[PDB]
């Protein structure tokens, strides 16, 4: 559950990210692929080399989705319905992977927005990404 | 310093038991969480009961305010009023029981928290003291690995683990302290050892009090649940009684007006 205080923390931290969201998304994927090689199996036809344009493109889509969730924190399931069917039913992404990407996004934010990444903000963002991860996996069977 | 195998073994055992104090107590303390959860659940249930019985309570209050007016008119001896009062006396008795048992539950809840806070503080003090005393013993044990002192003393010091093989107790800690009384270097810290043992006993006893208090609370809560249901079940007949006595009171008001 995101409290009003969490929502404020998320909106502020993501407001600082601003236009860097695509770059941060691409770096979180890059960190995920390199730290947890098993994730690469979901992208057999991607160029996953450092600086791949295909990864920068995907990082931008992932970031846009998160931006959209931040904009609609009170109605996240609805905002993410198409994505939730995509990930759970069509792609069948095991829930573990969402925790890997969530960790890598937090690492990316900590490295890029040190001023903003206080303990309370870290708790709020972990909770936000846990809500996104749950919405995207609740249909998995 | 520790120069014999015997001194090293007595010091080793003591250091382990002092270090074990915080570990054993954390485990014991964590058994009180179920009681904190239970007593918080009692409070929520009491709030729900209080809400559920409020209509029955409101009817009983309406009955008393109609009766007070009948007393003012000198008509409280009206046979219908008397009959209504007799009919509602079980509910009046049940309301007094509900008030008393809920208060007993809430006092037990306060006592659980108070004993838990003492157990926590006891654990924290025991750890502060225990870890420090174990560190002072380790100064001697570490020094005993080198220099003078027998090869057997050094080997025993090299073998000494930081941790006890099992959980400690008042008996085991006391046994370790008493054995170490014979050891020169350790003897300087005897009062420190005593305070650690008293904090262990205090924490442990507070945990026992949490458990006993929580049991008493649960018995009171069962009575609360039973009497709350009896009051809710009487709600409709209590509302009927409040209207009847209000009618009686209204007829006596109009009889007084018409008689002036």
């Amino acid at each position: 559950v995101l409290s009003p205080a969490d929502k404020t923390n998320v909106k502020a931290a993501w407001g600082k990210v601003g236009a860097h969201a695509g770059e941060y998304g691409a770096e979180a994927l890059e960190r995920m692929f390199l730290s947890f090689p098993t994730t690469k199996t979901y992208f057999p036809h991607f160029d996953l080399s450092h600086g791949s344009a295909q990864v920068k493109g995907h990082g931008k889509k992932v970031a846009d989705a998160l931006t959209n969730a931040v904009a609609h924190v009170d109605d996240m399931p609805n905002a993410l319905s198409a994505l939730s069917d995509l990930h759970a039913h069509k792609l069948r992404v095991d829930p573990v992977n969402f925790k890997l990407l969530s960790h890598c996004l937090l690492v990316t934010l900590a490295a890029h927005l040190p001023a903003e990444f206080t303990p309370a903000v870290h708790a709020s963002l972990d909770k936000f990404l846990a809500s996104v991860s749950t919405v995207l996996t609740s249909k998995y069977r | 310093g520790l120069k014999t195998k015997d001194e090293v073994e007595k010091a080793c055992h003591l250091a382990q038991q002092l270090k074990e104090v915080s570990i054993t107590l954390g485990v014991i303390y964590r058994t009180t969480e179920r009681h904190s959860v239970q007593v918080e659940a009692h409070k929520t249930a009491i709030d729900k009961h209080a809400d559920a019985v409020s209509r029955a309570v409101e009817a009983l209050t309406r009955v008393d305010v109609a009766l007070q007016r009948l007393k003012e008119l000198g008509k409280a001896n009206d046979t219908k009023a008397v009959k209504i009062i007799e009919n509602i006396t079980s509910a009046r008795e049940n309301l007094a029981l509900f008030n008393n048992e809920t208060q007993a539950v809430l006092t037990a809840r306060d006592h659980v928290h108070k004993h838990r806070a003492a157990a926590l503080q006891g654990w924290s003090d025991a750890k502060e003291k225990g870890d420090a005393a174990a560190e002072d013993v380790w100064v001697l044990l570490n020094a005993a690995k080198k220099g003078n002192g027998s090869a057997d003393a050094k080997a025993a010091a090299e073998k000494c683990s930081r941790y006890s093989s099992s959980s400690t107790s008042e008996t085991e800690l006391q046994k370790a302290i008493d054995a170490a009384a014979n050891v020169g270097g350790l003897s300087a810290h005897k009062s420190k050892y005593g305070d650690v043992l008293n904090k262990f006993k205090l924490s442990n006893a507070s945990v026992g009090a949490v458990r006993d208090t929580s049991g008493r609370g649960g018995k009171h809560m069962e009575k609360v649940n039973n009497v709350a249901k009896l009051l809710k079940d009487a709600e409709v007949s209590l509302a009927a009684a409040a209207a009847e006595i209000e009618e009686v009171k209204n007829a006596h008001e109009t009889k007084v007006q018409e008689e002036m």
Binding site: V107, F117, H122 | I23, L120
Partner: protein, 141 residues
Amino acid sequence: HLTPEEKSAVTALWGKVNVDEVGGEALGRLLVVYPWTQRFFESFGDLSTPDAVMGNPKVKAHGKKVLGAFSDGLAHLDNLKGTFATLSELHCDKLHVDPENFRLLGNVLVCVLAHHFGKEFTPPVQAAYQKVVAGVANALA
């Protein structure tokens, strides 16, 4: 297993860590982000707010001890099992700590390193630290 190149990037980074602070900050954050961990540490006194947690002397002190054990692990990457056998016996057999919490602390530590090192905490250095935290978690389990 760490390439010698990875062992190198890791110890290179570690050499720059404020040994007196990052331990308390990683433990402090574990307690704020994953509050159920507090039940092992309620003996630390006031943990009621993130500032109370982060500023608590007992959190700081205990943090130093945890970090110290990670430092020992770094000196023995080849034998983490043997190095952590006594500690595993404490956490496992005496404390009954769910082994998932070791991974959470490790991950919080990675976040702290990212927080303090920024850009220097590159994806390849993260990947090497992920091997270390997993290795330390498995050895503690």
